[PDB]
Amino acid sequence: ILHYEKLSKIGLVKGVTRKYKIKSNPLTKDIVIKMIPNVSNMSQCTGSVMENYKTRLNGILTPIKGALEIYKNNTHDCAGVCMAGVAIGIATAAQITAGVALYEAMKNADNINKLKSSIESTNEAVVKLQETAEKTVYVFTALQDYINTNLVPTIDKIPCKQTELSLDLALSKYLSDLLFVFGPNLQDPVSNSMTIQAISQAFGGNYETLLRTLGYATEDFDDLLESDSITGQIIYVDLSSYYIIVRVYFPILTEIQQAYIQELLPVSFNNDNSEWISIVPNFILVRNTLISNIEIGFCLITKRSVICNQDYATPMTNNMRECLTGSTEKCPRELVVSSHVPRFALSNGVLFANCISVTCQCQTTGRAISQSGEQTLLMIDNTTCPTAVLGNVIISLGKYLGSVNYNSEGIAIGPPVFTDKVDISSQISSMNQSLQ
Amino acid sequence: ILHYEKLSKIGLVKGVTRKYKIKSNPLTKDIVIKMIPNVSNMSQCTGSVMENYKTRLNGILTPIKGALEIYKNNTHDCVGDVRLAGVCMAGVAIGIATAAQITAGVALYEAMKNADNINKLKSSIESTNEAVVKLQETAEKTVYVFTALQDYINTNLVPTIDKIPCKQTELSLDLALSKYLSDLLFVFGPNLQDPVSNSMTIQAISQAFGGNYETLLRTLGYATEDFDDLLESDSITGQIIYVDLSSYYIIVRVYFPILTEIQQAYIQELLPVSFNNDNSEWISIVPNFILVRNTLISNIEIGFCLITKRSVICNQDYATPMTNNMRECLTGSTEKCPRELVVSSHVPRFALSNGVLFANCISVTCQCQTTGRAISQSGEQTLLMIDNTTCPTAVLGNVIISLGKYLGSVNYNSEGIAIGPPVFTDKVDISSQISSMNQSLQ
Amino acid sequence: ILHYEKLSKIGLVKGVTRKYKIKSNPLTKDIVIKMIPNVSNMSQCTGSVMENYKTRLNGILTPIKGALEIYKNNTHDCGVCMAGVAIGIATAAQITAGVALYEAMKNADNINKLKSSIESTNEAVVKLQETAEKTVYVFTALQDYINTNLVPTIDKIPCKQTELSLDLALSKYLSDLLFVFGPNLQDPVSNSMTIQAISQAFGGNYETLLRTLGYATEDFDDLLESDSITGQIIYVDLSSYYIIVRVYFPILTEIQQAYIQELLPVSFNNDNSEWISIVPNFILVRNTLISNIEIGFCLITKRSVICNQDYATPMTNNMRECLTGSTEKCPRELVVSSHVPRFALSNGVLFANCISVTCQCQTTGRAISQSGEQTLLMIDNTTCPTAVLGNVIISLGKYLGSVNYNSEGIAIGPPVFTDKVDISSQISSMNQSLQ
């Protein structure tokens, strides 16, 4: 376990504890995203930009279909998915799993494609088709709302030639928004790591419409969405009607047993007439009594849990482990140069503060609370006095649960470090030169 | 304190010198953003999308008010003339809080004194049907309401309420609200774990108003000539002080600081130039920007700061430490400066400071126009200084340059220096090097 | 030069080989962006918002003119000839950009000669003739929005305070602008600014610009994604509020005897534990010289690596030895996640860690067993053709290297930790050990 008592003397006070949940058990829903809007109502003077748009869109979609055919021509039946590796050549584990999922989805892709004429004839933003007697499919048209709302009503008021330039500019803008996602960046269409946010760029970035039409099956939906846990996969691309069918995955957040997130709040502390701040990861994964880092920038942090669409556990150095579980002499520290570093923090109703670097006094007696040059921070609680003042704040305090003699015992301190990108190279160079 | 001559001979030519300023002394203005639009003029056949959007917005806005109530329930005015007589904090009922979070809590209570008065206007705030509205708060005070989706409704849906089928207007609306929510979730969604703090930029806040912060700031007022600055450096910040789940409108206190230039504090930029040594090209690895204040030399993490032509602007004192060896290197101990071998052919090879030209004439062909002959660099000179004493007009490829006179040593080009050890700065190189030294130590 | 057989043993399965091509030989074209719309049709409800927008845009554009005028005032014919005394601080890129700016003034004079024509444009794209032979296109920022929404609605409503909507539209446009042409912009001289960023003055619609300019290359998408198509500001006008941009359209020139090799990572067992090796995913080989590349800046395709600049960086000598057969110098990292790839296929040949994923090939009708001394188990049609892993049944080809692959062992490198705090902790521990 983490020893929070010695960690608070270093400047790391306990924060919230959070439960770790990962994406798992994903359901499947199939939708149709039509990249080319229906322009039947505006075709009388749509100009020649429709053909140019079609050619440009082929220029984008053709590599996607080409990369899909590599798996399309290598999946068949021999019971289950039967792969042929000679004609594949280069593929990762994720690519092979995506190919198996692709062949699975081909069974419903055939039935969806059986309604090609219905798919092409769609002229609403969200259209319902009866793909079979007991199941339906939704069709989303990329720019159909724009055409029905702005361009179609203004087909005779504004100059149509101007309408021709408008429609064009709209197409262009849609293509420009697409190309960040569906352009040559999409080297591997056989993948399910692509978020619904990116796929919705084929619909104007409006993933809310897609998901709401599909259905908010779970109460953890927002955490799934922000974590981009709702992923998708392209399973069929048509170069004749310019549509792609996407199998959206709707998973459930599975609480990982015997696992939690611990967050530590850094507090600047005083040592040798200077301010220092200790460098440890702000967040720690503890799973089955094993301590390991957690790339968190990708995860989503809530007040009670940390939601990750992948298991982002990353290794911890033994030295960092020891530092977190008591050996504070191994905890590195960096000198403070920012006038705006945190100086106090509230944990469990009790305050740990550096009262030599900040104004520090008590409300119930009016007297100042003095910090010596030997001690790093102060535990202020109702025992010393039940209300403290730190500049403009007046704070009533609660009891402490740890040692009664917290402020009368000192600890050892670690070595100074510098965490700049260039500082790493210089320290390596000097250490190498020192060794030589 | 920086010795420019040895830096130049290594390849760190002089750059511009800029002052250091920080956000300071923030004035406050209070506004409200109604995250729900008034659909009264087009409510005839809006359908049920209004209710569903209501529930979705309630679901998103509920955690914000839940986090705010942790401070609201626990904030109170301490009694009697003994202390500054401000706000008391039920710290045991708060549990977990940082210095910045508590500070924001205090500013939240402070703003409550005005937020109660603005909440008296609840019926007026509901009645707003324009994208910007001004309201009287008192006979000597005013407040602004911004409608999240009023411009779109009033410009497209109301005029086109009959020319198209009403069902189509239903979809369009639904799509518009869903687009709003999708743009919103990046800021006001579950990413917003701490709404109490005031570190959130006005650009992020404007996402609740369609990303149009320029309207927020213009309507409030261009208080100073530095306006673009406090804007880009993320110095203009706002705080949510009251969330209402019945009218779906939040009150935001916008902060307009003033930029205090720090005295005895300037930012120096160094230009790197590839230099020849041991029959190969190298580039030194030093910070491009260095902060020297109170004769003290420290780095700066300028990525979050704004580098204008004359000053470096930061919404926070972003000064960071610098290694002792880097201080000695920038002081003159030039052998402690690291250098990186360059394999790219697109690294700059010459630079101009004070009108004197530093160049690597081994890598790039140099000749002088006045004498019509080549400018030669020998194998033991890292860089060649060219100035009017050398010749008043030299060329480097396709550029004709006229040079001024040097201010330092007259015999610059005849004096050599020591050179440091090579380094490699790839992400995997650091791990590879650390293993090598560890194995060497064992 | 890369020993792929030995790299497979450490988890680096050989992947796709791609061809390296860099930006070179840029053509030049001239466009004019007028960053304020012409509203002569809706001058009725333009109200006063336009004067405030004029002031705001003048304040925005003044530093750009100031930072161009340093080279405007200090360059003259004496080819291109420049005054370095009054310029003072300048980089190689800045000097080259100023030279190109001077070359562009020759056409900039003729372009400015049509100032009245430029300011009279009332569409998003209008064709103008600067000479008897050459033509120029002019792009106005919000003319489409105006002509499609505000113009029709001006008689479809009693103005309904159109100001409120025009003001907001111009405000949103300026909010979009401030990210690129706002304070951030410090060196408008340099030509490293991408056409995507330039199009923010036109609403981010770079596709219209590139289509109207008439691209005529098959590498157009690779040019656009790799940030190869850049622009340069050559003149600013504060009276009509338009700027001239010289768009550079380059061509992809393949670097001879150069290719980039991709390594696919696969977890491997060692000492009853699972590791992943820390080696760059993409490796550039040029004339039998091996160097790294920050491939995040470039674009990766199925058959080529496209960068707008030569992004080669040096590699440690030890890493070079690691990638050339001596596997003991290759660092490895412990795998504390359950979502690391565990198998990969190379040349129809499967590499997998059968300890961590169950293997039972259907042709033999039995499980595939990996000992406690084999990092990866290699399967091909020589052992049994079709293998099954989890839910995939895959048929396999034949290996081309050593037939005795599974029987030979190798040495393994030392563990590493790649977190930034881990690096600092390792540095501190090594320093303390030295002391």
UniProtKB/Swiss-Prot annotation, chain C:
GO terms for cellular component: host cell plasma membrane; membrane; viral envelope; virion membrane. Changing T217I: In strain: Isolate NiV/MY/99/VRI-0626. The inactive precursor F0 is glycosylated and proteolytically cleaved into F1 and F2 to be functionally active. The cleavage is mediated by cellular proteases during the transport and maturation of the polypeptide. GO terms for biological process: fusion of virus membrane with host plasma membrane; membrane fusion involved in viral entry into host cell; symbiont entry into host cell. It is a single-pass type I membrane protein; Single-pass membrane protein. Glycans are attached at N38, N41, N73, N381, N431. Residues 79-101 are annotated as: Fusion peptide. The keyword Transmembrane applies. Residues 1-435 are extracellular. Keywords: Coiled coil, Disulfide bond, Fusion of virus membrane with host cell membrane, Fusion of virus membrane with host membrane, Glycoprotein, Host cell membrane, Host membrane, Membrane, Signal, Transmembrane, Transmembrane helix, Viral envelope protein, Viral penetration into host cytoplasm, Virion, Virus entry into host cell. Disulfide bonds join C45-C159, C298-C307, C322-C330, C354-C359, C361-C384. Residues 102-130 form a coiled coil. It is found in: Virion membrane; Host cell membrane. Homotrimer; disulfide-linked F1-F2. Interacts with the Glycoprotein G; this interaction involves both head and stalk regions of glygoprotein G. In pre-fusion state, found as a dimer of trimer. Class I viral fusion protein. Under the current model, the protein has at least 3 conformational states: pre-fusion native state, pre-hairpin intermediate state, and post-fusion hairpin state. During viral and plasma cell membrane fusion, the heptad repeat (HR) regions assume a trimer-of-hairpins structure, positioning the fusion peptide in close proximity to the C-terminal region of the ectodomain. The formation of this structure appears to drive apposition and subsequent fusion of viral and plasma cell membranes. Belongs to the paramyxoviruses fusion glycoprotein family. This is Fusion glycoprotein F0. It comes from Nipah virus. The chain holds residues 27 to 468 of 546 of the full protein.
